[PDB]
Design an enzyme around this catalytic site. Structure first.
Site, short mmCIF file in Angstrom:
data_model
loop_
_atom_site.label_atom_id
_atom_site.label_comp_id
_atom_site.label_asym_id
_atom_site.label_seq_id
_atom_site.Cartn_x
_atom_site.Cartn_y
_atom_site.Cartn_z
N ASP A 142 -6.17 6.33 -4.92
CA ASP A 142 -5.75 4.93 -4.99
C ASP A 142 -5.78 4.42 -6.44
O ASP A 142 -6.03 5.19 -7.39
CB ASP A 142 -6.56 4.05 -4.02
CG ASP A 142 -8.01 3.86 -4.44
OD1 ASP A 142 -8.38 4.20 -5.58
OD2 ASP A 142 -8.79 3.33 -3.61
N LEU B 174 -8.79 4.19 2.68
CA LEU B 174 -9.78 4.77 1.79
C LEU B 174 -10.61 5.81 2.54
O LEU B 174 -11.14 5.53 3.62
CB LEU B 174 -10.67 3.67 1.22
CG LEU B 174 -11.87 4.07 0.36
CD1 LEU B 174 -11.40 4.65 -0.96
CD2 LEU B 174 -12.76 2.86 0.13
N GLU C 248 0.79 -1.23 0.00
CA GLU C 248 0.00 0.00 0.00
C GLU C 248 0.82 1.27 0.00
O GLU C 248 0.32 2.33 -0.38
CB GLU C 248 -0.96 0.02 1.20
CG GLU C 248 -2.00 -1.10 1.20
CD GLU C 248 -3.06 -0.95 0.13
OE1 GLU C 248 -3.11 0.10 -0.55
OE2 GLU C 248 -3.86 -1.89 -0.02
#
Ligand SMILES: N#CCNc1ccccc1
Length: 162
Positions: free
Chosen positions: A20, A32, A11
């Site tokens: 993203d 998120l 990530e």
């Protein structure tokens, strides 16, 4: 290697709001914020998550705090899911990390629908499961990451994370 180090690799860490792989506003270690195209909506979600007016920027400590919450919530969700729990509990600890990784990225509903992969994993048919896992939007859209996660499912080792 452990789930935190694994997801940190997959990530990254960014301290300012970014989009993203799917184009959604995100911060930190893959946290998120919202699927809304409105940056102000993302900023509102950020401020709510952190508990202060952030104006789109957080600290490393704050990113790590969200990350711990997100990893914890991902696991607890798996355990609450009637389809996922028995498969997860059937796995060794390394493969459990691969399961958490996928749910962290995709969300639990999507993964719960991987009916054939789930069955193969519970059966410990590792090569077959790995082949089935790659027949997915997931793999096609994020192939390098999916390959790492799939190798982890296939082998029960950390070989893909060097
Ligand atoms: N299907 C598949 C792989 N991911 C996964 C996610 C949660 C529990 C067990 C497996």
């Amino acid at each position: 290697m452990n789930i935190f180090e694994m997801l940190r690799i997959d990530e990254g860490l960014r301290l300012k709001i970014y989009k993203d792989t799917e184009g959604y506003y995100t911060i930190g270690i893959g946290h998120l914020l919202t699927k809304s195209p409105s940056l102000n909506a993302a900023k509102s979600e950020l401020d709510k998550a952190i508990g202060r007016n952030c104006n789109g920027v957080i600290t490393k400590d704050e990113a790590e705090k969200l990350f711990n919450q997100d990893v914890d919530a991902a696991v607890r969700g798996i355990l609450r899911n009637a389809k996922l729990k028995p498969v997860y509990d059937s796995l060794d600890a390394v493969r459990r990390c691969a399961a958490i990784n996928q749910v962290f990225q995709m969300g639990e509903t999507g993964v719960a629908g991987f009916t054939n992969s789930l069955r193969m994993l519970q059966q410990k048919r590792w090569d077959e499961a790995a082949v089935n896992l790659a027949k997915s939007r997931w793999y096609n859209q994020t192939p390098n990451r999916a390959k790492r996660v799939i190798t982890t499912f296939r082998t029960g080792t950390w070989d893909a994370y060097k």
